[PDB]
Amino acid sequence: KVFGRCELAAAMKRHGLDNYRGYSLGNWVCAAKFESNFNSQATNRNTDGSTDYGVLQINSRWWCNDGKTPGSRNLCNIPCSALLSSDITATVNCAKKIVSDGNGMNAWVAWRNRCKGTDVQAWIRGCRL
């Protein structure tokens, strides 16, 4: 499923991401845009044998189990396939854990390269929230 920009923002707000750990909603929407372009089915193979899944491209080495990543620890305790859902609940719950893992939102390379330090409020422009 490919969400509309404001469609995802609203869904994220409903799930408590606005200002979570002091990160405004714009940051999360900007991260999803650059990580997956709002496509819940997005997957990326990593030259290292791990894979990134979903709208927030969560990694199989530590966060979810995909049954093909040597030395995986499943910290979010879910199958990675649950991250390819049109329901972002699993993605959000896992994201909250990742963002509190000690590197802030730097955990998302796309957010760091394209969102960090910019005017992130542009990302929820036109949205009724």
Curated annotation (Swiss-Prot):
Note: Lysozyme C is capable of both hydrolysis and transglycosylation; it also shows a slight esterase activity. It acts rapidly on both peptide-substituted and unsubstituted peptidoglycan, and slowly on chitin oligosaccharides.
Pfam families: Lys
GO biological process, one term: defense response to Gram-positive bacterium
Record has Nucleus as a keyword: no
Annotated active site: 35, 52
Keywords annotated in UniProt: Antimicrobial, Bacteriolytic enzyme, Disulfide bond, Glycosidase, Hydrolase, Secreted
Reaction(s) this enzyme catalyzes, per UniProt: Hydrolysis of (1->4)-beta-linkages between N-acetylmuramic acid and N-acetyl-D-glucosamine residues in a peptidoglycan and between N-acetyl-D-glucosamine residues in chitodextrins
Lineage of source species: Eukaryota, Metazoa, Chordata, Craniata, Vertebrata
Protein name: Lysozyme C
Domain of life: Eukaryota
